[PDB]
Amino acid sequence: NLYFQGAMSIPRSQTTYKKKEGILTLTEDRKFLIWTPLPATGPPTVSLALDNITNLQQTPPGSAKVILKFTERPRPNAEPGAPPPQYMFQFTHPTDARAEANAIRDLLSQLLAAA
Numbered sequence: 001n002l003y004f005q006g007a008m009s010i011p012r013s014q015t016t017y018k019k020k021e022g023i024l025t026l027t028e029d030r031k032f033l034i035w036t037p038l039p040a041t042g043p044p045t046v047s048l049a050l051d052n053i054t055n056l057q058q059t060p061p062g063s064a065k066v067i068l069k070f071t072e073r074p075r076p077n078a079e080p081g082a083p084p085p086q087y088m089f090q091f092t093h094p095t096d097a098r099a100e101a102n103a104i105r106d107l108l109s110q111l112l113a114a115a
């Protein structure tokens, strides 16, 4: 009968989006997935509300690249045959790219179930 919220810290992952290196994390309130290009002192160039995320995919282990792919809910007036918005982040920490991908994946999946 208790209620439990997740308490794992929010990770800051070194990731490439559209060929530029950056940082992938969540906002402190865990309601948006955000990517900011390096140096990460400007605002994020990608904000994905978790309320709008419909799918989370990854490249399998042993792949050339560690990438998570996030699929979103269709835009309001998108055409009925169009593919839904997708956002790929390549993990580029030389030793920890997969571990970093699994951390974020696990935390996003926890947060997505709970909503």
Ligand SMILES: [Cl-]
Pocket (backbone or CB within 6 Å): 060, 061, 062, 063, 066, 098
């Ligand atoms: Cl791997």
Ligand SMILES: [K+]
Pocket (backbone or CB within 6 Å): 011, 012, 013, 014, 100
């Ligand atoms: K990290």
